[PDB]
Design a protein around this ligand. Sequence first.
Ligand code: HEM
Ligand code: HEM
Lengths: 406, 406
Amino acid sequence: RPQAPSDFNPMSEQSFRDPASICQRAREETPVFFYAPLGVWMVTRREDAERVLSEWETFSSLANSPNVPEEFRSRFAPSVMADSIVAIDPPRHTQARNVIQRGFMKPKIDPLEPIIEQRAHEIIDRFAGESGTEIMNNYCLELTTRTLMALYDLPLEDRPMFERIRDVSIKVLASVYEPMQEPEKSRVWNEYVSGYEYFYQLVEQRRNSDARDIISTMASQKDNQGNPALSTERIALHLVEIAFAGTDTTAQMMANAILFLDSHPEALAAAKADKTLWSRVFEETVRRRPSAPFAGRITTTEVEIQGVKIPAGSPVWVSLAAANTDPRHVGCPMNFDINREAPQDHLAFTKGRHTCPGAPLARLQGATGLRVLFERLPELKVVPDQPLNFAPMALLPVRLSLQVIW
Amino acid sequence: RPQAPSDFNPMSEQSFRDPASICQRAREETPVFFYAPLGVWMVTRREDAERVLSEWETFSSLANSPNVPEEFRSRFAPSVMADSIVAIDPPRHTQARNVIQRGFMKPKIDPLEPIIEQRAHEIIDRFAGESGTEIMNNYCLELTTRTLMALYDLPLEDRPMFERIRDVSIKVLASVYEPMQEPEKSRVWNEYVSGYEYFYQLVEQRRNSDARDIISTMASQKDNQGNPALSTERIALHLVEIAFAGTDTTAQMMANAILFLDSHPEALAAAKADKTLWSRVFEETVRRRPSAPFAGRITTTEVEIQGVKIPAGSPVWVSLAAANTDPRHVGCPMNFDINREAPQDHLAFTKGRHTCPGAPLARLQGATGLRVLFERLPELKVVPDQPLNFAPMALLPVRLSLQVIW
Ligand code: HEM
Ligand code: HEM
């Protein structure tokens, strides 16, 4: 069975600095292969990438499934966890999506730009009088958390718990891989269920609310028969998943955009002169360095990709970094050129049913934050020679530190 | 059942000149309704538009299906016609699409730009010395036919039949509603089958060819077991369908782009000054005036759209003009502003499985021809007050004449 080139290692620091650098030789030489250290098939070319991400009937998304402990099944039934937005397919995934996507529409997200700018200025006021700061937790992650809280429309008193909402979730994801012992398992799962019940109560209270918050936007969705389009359990679980899935991705996006603007100062000045380039500064970043460089699916039958035969039930990962940097679709795929004619023509948000629903917000945040970040501290320059601090993760390399000065 | 505002009439001249003008009041007031003069459901909002265009499992494409005459079934079996790319759904549509998409990739389409530019200059040289011309057939339609012949890589000696390929096919489409009488039916269907057999022979001869032309690109697709991925009959039928679906659409795109550049001289000057804007001149045109302003589907079960319940088996049309001009997705939806940040964020090529596969070519053609047209004849001005000549059709309003001067 086909193997992988030597330079292809998603767990190396070379992947943490540039996920697409390890994928060029692989895509060129072995477009579809098998990765044994992860035990999954690997697809790199954009054609096959879009095929796998689109054909849901052939490449299902059932690959992820946490298990609920026994003592919490009275408050959080296992079917609720089985209704995870990442672990469902039509007709259930479409039923959940028709409600989830209703909250990220332009009339709902556009009125958040002034709030994002205001809170970003408030955050910058905390360290604007110094000479340098750790921009990751102090700005990027902080601004993402505040933007998600504004989308949820939650008071600052609930800010701690909301942060915990992501810290718990990742641990839950690791449970199938590094099982938790007691009393860590009970504590983590109880905090998870507590956040779930908090969102449950918020949905029950905002069930007939006609406001901008995603809770009221998803709760007020009633079918022709008056019945709620999504049960309260499903809405609460999807709110938890949205909170946990947006924060790290958007924070990594902002960090990578800061890095790219530091490595390309002329594009930074050009973007400082015209605001309409900021979105492009977004789009070229997430294309060149996607926050989630891997998208997982599972085959429902036997497939043939690039002549390689893949048996039924085989987990297949699409390397979004290889697809976004395919020379067969974009000229100079490794360059950071914000002046491309088709900026949003990438798979950084995948494609099809499981397309990233938080893309309208993230973009706006990326368009709003970076500008403000380069409007308050213009000579912001990423400190060279700072030890790379990355959480060793394959699907989502999270940067823990990024020292910047101005 | 909900009706439509008075101004909504797809068969009126107001729709032929601007398909989005009849859709604004409808989209705002009655987003999903029933049109009795056509007997079909109408969906206008972009939110529901993407769902209907994407959810193939709920909104199938089986609504269109011509019937094969009896005497030609020995040369053109009815199952071959049943394998029409517009009348199939997964798993057959995926099998056909995996082969069709291989011919429109960037490495295949990009080497056609210089040929398109050269042939556009050759065409302009025929009438550049006059003072005015009918730009539709002399340039738009001519350039589209020559571009399709270059994609097929056919000699000019094959120009007549190829032209006939468009004249015949539409009549076949008109058979399901306005049946043909004798002896025209036999002659037209024999010409259709003759073109089908010509493409069959071209596929058999280019079966082992490794060139860029769509015939060799689709014919050389063989699975891991050496067998052809698609039978020769289906490849020939798909070539016929590709020509017939590209010609009129790209010609109407170019005509509408000429009209929009005439109505906005500052954008025309900006595009003349910078080549990178020509593509945007494309994208803003096809957004403001899509060549095919309606996309048809058929429901497989009962659906709920905007609270309106639509029974199973109901033909539903998505008004692409209303979706591309939805104020819920784009600000100032009726203006022709080529300086938008997200130019390709429209449904002019729909979305999902049945997305227009010729979009890479059309764009390339639209950017290449028009530019040359405004590089040879810069002071081109569309003659005001000329009787609008449109073939009275709902799914594809084709303009028959457009007099221009310079
Ligand atoms: C620039 C930042 C972001 C990037 C690069 C990004 C990227 C992605 C990727 C790669 C996926 C996987 C899709 C798949 O597996 O097919 C995804 C899904 C998802 N994203 Fe994001 N995302 C970002 C921001 C956000 C935000 C801000 C939110 C919410 C506020 C969000 C919520 C979600 C959800 C809920 C899913 C699951 C969709 C589903 O499975 O149905 N994302 N995103
Ligand atoms: C800007 C110019 C064009 C426009 C506006 C346009 C419009 C469209 C639209 C809206 C669809 C979607 C039909 C559906 O959803 O079922 C479509 C399908 C299609 N288009 Fe185009 N088109 C254009 C140019 C072309 C070109 C140059 C080709 C060359 C091959 C082409 C070939 C096709 C084919 C074969 C289909 C059927 C796809 C399928 O059903 O699988 N079109 N066209």
